[PDB]
Write a protein that binds this ligand. Structure first.
Ligand code: HEC
Lengths: 827, 104
């Protein structure tokens, strides 16, 4: 009837009709009835409770979606914070919503409704505000984790941690097996925002001129337009059939053109999503797409392998300008702060500045400044304009260069860390700060006319593809191969605790209790005492690797200066070293006693040397190269190489008992049953073969996975085989007669995975029934039809030398970020 | 695969970072000369990541079939930055031209 009177409109799709108003009518009713709002909202809420339950909803119903979205609102307008706090602060509500919806909407709801909340409430709400923003990449995307365990990683002050800990403690004698973090209180710094609307990597990401909406492009071949604040999904527009090389906003941001592998530049409307104009000229790919920063005119800088610089005009159907030169490909082509000029930057060593209106040549600069000490070649990655609109900030080879357009020469020079090559560079108009992507996901913040370290950015999943500034002067954005766009604060990241750890962490054993020994980034090492904030900083010359001795009292570490340095924990002034095996030393191990140093390198010889003795005993294997070794329960030395030659040596005298070659190529370590020295195996990166020492060749062969084998595991009292692979898959195989019986699939049929596919060392349970494995995160398996737990997670990707306590309770590990991770098992 | 299309994919996506020719210098990407038969990251003069050196496979048409498919997948942690060659024909072709030049 209301449709008949034309007060209301009705859309017909599916079985259920769909009703909605028209705007004017809405505002009208808004004005006509005001005082009665409260009545209405509290009415519908009361009704809702009287029928359904807040945590009880059937996703199969027809009304679910609406409730999930706007229920918070209807509570808010009711000005009732009690039932509000009751609903929102609840964890399961969050779980369900996130699973179905995703975080962004919810975040937005917090940010909006925070007002009605009380002063104390603000703290909690806030805790969530950062919580979800940080967890943004993990949540809502299944395979799905536990809410509680993620809540356990939160600061104690945060209500999230307190609730998660509460419920955790509530579930007892439950196969949940919760964990506790003492270390995360001083680490894992907060972030402004973390948002992934991507199944694929990000090629470029930048903020709009007005700082409102974000349009991102990547390997997904889909332009993603979403809100910059709470990260809600706005529009998803298909740019091309091929991967988009580069994309950028216009002056009014209302028009964004895309360039891709299909060699066709297509202008796309942001608020529409329909084709406006299309331009096909270039016979090569276009790596340069840049728009005007002014409303004066509209131009587009394009370049390709055809050695032509073409300047397009958005007003016409053709190209405005064409310029000769640049015999090589132009990596970065960018407009000046004025549209009257054009900047062309390539890696061939030619940096040119052309007149846009005059179309002629203004300036041409070839940089010989970088010294090679075989013609001189200086590559140029990127070109960033200074805030003054005159100087040009660039980064070449191992150094940063500041050019003056007036003098055309080298005006200034900024040093970059060590010999590392600069991958990317950017400059901030405010504070004259500049960020540089150098090596291994490291974004370093430096200041001009300073040459002193300002800030360092860590916590990334991968080496930063690229980073930009938000020109409010307040903050900046980061984009990596982790497929996630992040918002970071300039002044907040500036503070660094210098907890960085490079390749290694070292566990210490005091009786049952475990202690932490870290290798310091700056000089030597940092000693961290267990269950306390006691830290003893030890400073010496740089070290390549470190190794702890049995019975303790000593330490043995290799350096970058060569050979091996042995030092006593009692007195640091006393040290012993000898020069042998010029090649890089990898593995260093003492014998069962504190004497008879056994060391190896990359070479045909392994050294056995006695100290306080100075006995030099060389053991020749007569091969191409030797990888590493290990000590068994006996005096025998089990060693492996790249040639697939497994040898058994002895102390003080070179001896070969047997020779085991499983396959061709590099063999990874060795795998023993730990029940005895009889059964022994190793990973040949092809199949899994085991020998009982009943022959010179492996007795049993397992072909189950022939593609790649990362590792294998024999559990005690069982002997059942657990195969780790390069794909990061852990397969369970029943072993009795040395043949394959059972079957399990670790991989998911849900499709490709983003982060994972890495495993190094596997651990065992004290019961023997449970299993501990790493699929890129912490994942516990189980024998006989199903596993233990998928619980929690491991931040980052790469892992190195997983270690555990002998009681199999407290755990010690580290990610690629070099952050200390300590686990404690308590009921 | 095809040799000359392999030289095309070489001059495009390879030759800028690599040398497959005999006695080629090391670059951002390593000298690839004598690739087949040589283990991952064994070439002197270029500093490899441990991710590549611990890979230790023997480069071949199939190893590159899997690697060039998704170079971050096959050797995780490599400082090689590439989004992967999804097309098989491109792989076979490029690898073929590698089998030509690196042998020469
Ligand atoms: C933008 C960077 C980049 C691109 C593009 C690139 N490479 Fe690589 N590549 C590298 C780097 C850096 C390494 C060394 C990896 C290491 O040291 O860990 C490498 C390693 C390799 C290796 C392994 C060499 C060995 O001895 O194990 C091969 C083969 C190779 N590249 C060939 C290719 C091919 C084929 C392509 C494209 C079809 C390509 N590269 C494109 C950077 C690149």
């Amino acid at each position: 009837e209301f449709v008949n009177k034309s007060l209301l409109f009705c859309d017909r799709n599916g079985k259920s009709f769909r009703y909605y108003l028209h705007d004017l009518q809405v505002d009208f009713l808004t004005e006509k009835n005001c005082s009665q709002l409260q009545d209405l909202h509290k009415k519908i809420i009361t009704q809702f409770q009287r029928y359904h339950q807040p945590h009880t909803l059937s996703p199969d119903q027809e009304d679910c979606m609406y409730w999930y979205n706007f229920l918070a609102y209807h509570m808010a307008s009711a000005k009732m914070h009690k039932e509000l706090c009751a609903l929102m602060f609840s964890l399961d509500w969050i779980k369900a919503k996130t699973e179905l919806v995703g975080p962004a909407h919810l975040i937005h709801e917090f940010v909006e409704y925070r007002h009605i909340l009380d002063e104390k409430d603000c703290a909690v709400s806030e805790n969530f505000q950062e919580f979800l923003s940080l967890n943004g990449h993990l949540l809502g995307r299944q395979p799905f984790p536990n809410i509680v365990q993620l809540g356990l990683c939160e600061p104690e002050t945060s209500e999230v941690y307190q609730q998660a800990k509460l419920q955790a403690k509530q579930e007892v004698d439950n196969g949940m097996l919760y964990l506790e973090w003492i270390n995360k209180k001083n680490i894992t710094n907060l972030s402004r925002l973390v948002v992934r609307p991507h199944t694929d990597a990000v090629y470029h990401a930048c903020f709009s001129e007005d700082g409102q909406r974000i349009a991102s492009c990547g390997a997904d071949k889909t332009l993603q337009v979403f809100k910059a604040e709470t990260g809600e999904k706005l529009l998803e527009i298909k740019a091309h059939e091929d991967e988009v090389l580069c994309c950028a906003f216009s002056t009014d941001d209302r028009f964004i053109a895309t360039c891709s592998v299909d060699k066709k530049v297509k202008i796309w409307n942001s608020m529409t999503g329909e084709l406006v104009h299309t331009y096909d000229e270039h016979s090569e790919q276009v790596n340069c797409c840049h728009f005007t920063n002014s409303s004066h005119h509209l131009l587009l800088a394009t370049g390709s392998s055809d050695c032509f610089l073409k300047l397009w005009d958005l007003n016409q159907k053709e190209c405005r300008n064409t310029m000769f030169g640049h015999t090589n490909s132009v990596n970065h082509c960018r407009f000046s702060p004025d549209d009257k000029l054009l900047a062309s930057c390539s890696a061939d060593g030619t940096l040119k500045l052309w007149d846009a209106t005059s179309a002629n040549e203004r300036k041409s600069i070839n940089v010989k400044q970088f010294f090679l000490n075989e013609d001189m070649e200086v590559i140029v990655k990127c070109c960033s304009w200074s805030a003054d609109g005159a100087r040009i900030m660039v980064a070449a080879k191992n150094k940063i260069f500041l050019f003056d357009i007036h003098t055309s020469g080298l005006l200034g020079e900024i040093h970059t860390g060590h010999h590392s090559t600069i991958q990317y560079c950017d400059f901030s108009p405010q504070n004259h700060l500049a960020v540089v992507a150098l090596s291994q996901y490291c974004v370093e913040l430096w200041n001009t006319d300073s040459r002193s370290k300002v800030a360092d950015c860590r916590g990334h999943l991968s080496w930063v593809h690229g980073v930009m500034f938000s020109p409010d002067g307040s903050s900046f954005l980061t984009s990596s191969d982790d497929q996630t766009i992040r918002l970071w604060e300039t002044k907040k990241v500036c503070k660094n605790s210098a907890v960085m750890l490079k390749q290694e962490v070292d566990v210490v054993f005091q009786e049952n209790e475990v202690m932490v020994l870290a290798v310091d980034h700056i000089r030597r090492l940092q000693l961290i005492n267990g269950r306390t904030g006691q830290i003893d900083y030890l400073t010496e010359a740089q070290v390549s690797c470190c190794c702890l001795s049995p019975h303790l009292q000593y330490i043995a570490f290799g350096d970058e200066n060569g050979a091996i340095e042995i030092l006593e924990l009692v007195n640091n002034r006393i040290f012993q070293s000898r020069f042998q095996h010029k090649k890089t030393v990898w593995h260093i191990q003492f014998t069962a006693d504190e004497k008879t140093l056994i060391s190896s390198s990359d070479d045909a010889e392994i050294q056995v040397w006695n100290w306080q003795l100075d006995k030099c005993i060389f053991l020749r294997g007569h091969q191409e190269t030797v990888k590493d070794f290990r000590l068994l329960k006996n005096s025998r030395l089990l060693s492996w190489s790249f040639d697939g030659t497994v040898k058994v040596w002895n102390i003080i005298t070179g001896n070969k008992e047997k020779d085991f070659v499983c396959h061709q190529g590099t063999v990874l370590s060795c795998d023993i049953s730990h029940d005895a020295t009889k059964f022994s195996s190793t990973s040949a990166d092809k199949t899994a073969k085991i020998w009982s020492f009943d022959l010179l060749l492996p007795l049993h062969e397992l072909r189950g996975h022939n593609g790649c084998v990362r590792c294998s595991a024999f559990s005690v009292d069982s002997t059942l085989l657990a195969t780790g692979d390069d794909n990061g898959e852990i397969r369970i195989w029943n072993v009795s007669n040395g043949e394959l019986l059972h079957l399990c699939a670790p991989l998911s049929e849900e499709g490709a995975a983003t982060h994972g596919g890495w495993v190094t060392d596997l651990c065992f349970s004290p019961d023997g029934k449970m299993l501990i494995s790493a699929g890129g995160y912490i994942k516990w398996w189980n024998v006989v039809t199903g596993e233990s737990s998928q619980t929690f997670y491991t931040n980052g990707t790469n892992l190195k030398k997983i270690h555990v306590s002998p009681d199999f309770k407290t755990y010690v590990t580290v990610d690629n970020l070099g952050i200390l991770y300590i686990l404690q098992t308590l009921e | 695969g095809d040799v000359e299309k392999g030289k095309k994919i070489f001059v495009q996506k390879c030759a800028q970072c690599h040398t497959v020719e005999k006695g080629g210098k090391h670059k951002t990407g390593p000298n690839l000369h004598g690739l087949f038969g040589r283990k991952t990251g064994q070439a002197p003069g270029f500093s490899y990541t441990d991710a590549n050196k611990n890979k230790g496979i023997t480069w071949g048409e199939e190893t590159l079939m899997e690697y060039l498919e998704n170079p971050k997948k096959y050797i995780p942690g490599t400082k090689m930055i590439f989004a992967g060659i999804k097309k098989k024909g491109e792989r076979e072709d490029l690898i073929a031209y590698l089998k030509k030049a690196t042998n020469e």
